[PDB]
Amino acid sequence: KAQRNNEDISIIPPLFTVSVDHRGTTEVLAAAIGLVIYYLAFSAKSHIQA
């Protein structure tokens, strides 16, 4: 009734309240890191042999 009347809904006491605590809601990378280190190792090999 209050909601339909746009009355203050806070005046109406609930029977009880419950507080609900809500806390809220790789292989590519491994290949990439190994690739980059190996590629720079290849550059190192070229310089070493150069």
Next chain:
Amino acid sequence: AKSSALFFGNAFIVSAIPIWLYWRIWHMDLIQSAVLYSVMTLVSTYLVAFAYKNVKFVLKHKVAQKREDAVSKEVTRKRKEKDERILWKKNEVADYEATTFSIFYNNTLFLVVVIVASFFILKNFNPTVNYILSISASSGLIALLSTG
């Protein structure tokens, strides 16, 4: 040649590491799969150590070719009475870093091969087939590459 013991003490390491993710994401049975693991590690250690020697043996000369002038500089700065230091130290001076790079490169090479096979080709295959093909191909291909 007797230094090969170190190679044997190194070539096996990488062969067994992937067991973690295989037991965690491929959920391999470590008891039944131990048959495959032992063979794979043994073959890898054999050929990889042989590769270690081959790479270093094939390239060690370059170290002296490059830096022997500097090594001689420090040797003298420290002819028969003079040359002895060459045999005692200089040869090992070239050898020491030659081994370090040979093993370093071989190990660096191994990782990508297994990563590519397991997680980019054998994605769509049985974990049993995944481990079999990935490790076997890695070992054979890498050893052949070392012979390149």
